């Protein structure tokens, strides 16, 4: 992390599409280096379809500039995640900040 920042790291990191941010909040159900499975809270759930959220993290792919764009999970198992909170820290990101 920066350790002397300006409070704009969080917004910059979340406002690009790099980090896998939660669409409907819930409770984490299964974490892994290759995917995350989030159990949606029933209140937010649609009337049917018994949905859960699956997030397929990207693993070691080439960028345009020949760099490695991966995504590390940043939540433990059983961890409640609310709507709009990051899960995967893309390159140069740290807990959803911007670590250059």
């Amino acid at each position: 992390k920066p350790l002397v920042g300006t409070g704009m790291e969080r917004a910059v990191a979340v406002d690009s599409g790099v980090t896998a941010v939660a669409k409907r909040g819930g409770v984490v159900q299964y974490v892994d280096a290759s995917r995350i499975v989030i159990k949606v809270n029933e209140d937010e759930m649609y009337p049917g379809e018994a949905g859960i959220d699956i997030y397929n993290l990207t693993k070691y792919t080439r960028s345009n500039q020949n760099t490695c764009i991966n995504q590390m999970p940043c939540v433990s198992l059983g961890e409640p995640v609310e709507r709009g909170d990051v899960l995967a820290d893309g390159p140069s990101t740290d807990l959803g900040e911007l670590a250059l």
Partner: protein, 50 residues
């Protein structure tokens, strides 16, 4: 406020500490400014240039 935060730790308020020289062990006159600066690594790598 920077000084206040420096006091809240235990560090000297002027910002400058007194350093010793590794190769000779003697002390530097003129107290020197240490601290933690955020360094980047730019993508102009010497091995892509040679």
């Amino acid at each position: 406020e920077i000084k206040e935060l420096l006091k809240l730790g235990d560090l000297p308020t002027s910002g400058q500490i007194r350093l010793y020289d590794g190769r000779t062990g003697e002390q530097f006159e003129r107290p020197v400014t240490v601290g933690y600066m955020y360094m980047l690594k730019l993508n102009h790598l010497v091995d892509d240039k040679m």
